[PDB]
Symmetry: C4
Subunit: 43 residues, 4 copies
């Protein structure tokens, strides 16, 4: 089962890269949302 | 392969923690989007 | 290793529930974004 | 447990496919947010 075990490890590494993408894009999104909100509110 | 299995388990819980934080931040985005929409809706 | 194998399966089931949440929240977000965009554009 | 291992592998790739589609949709959100911001920025 060491072959399948290796597949699992490779999939997890692939999953991580995807989670990192989601994590960084989320940050950009919320930061943009806050700016948009500010453009529509009294300052 | 008990060493590998164990590693998979650790990594999974680590990535689940990242996905968890991600779901919480998405909730902030949805809430912020609703506030933006209201600022654009005749009240 | 059947014990650790079971932990893996349980973590994956937990991961799925989280991915479903992200998936549905994303839909709500984009739908709201499109509406907001429409409120700011010629119609 | 080769049956379980195999199952884990299948499920992982299935969930990775869902995360994959998720990352693509986030890109649409970021792009849509930039367009909304510009509609609010003196051009
Ligand atoms: Ca989002």
């Amino acid at each position: 089962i060491e072959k399948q075990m290796d597949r699992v490890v490779k999939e997890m590494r692939r999953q991580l890269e995807m989670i990192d993408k989601l994590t960084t894009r989320e940050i950009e999104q919320v930061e943009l949302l806050k700016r948009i909100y500010d453009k529509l509110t009294v300052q």
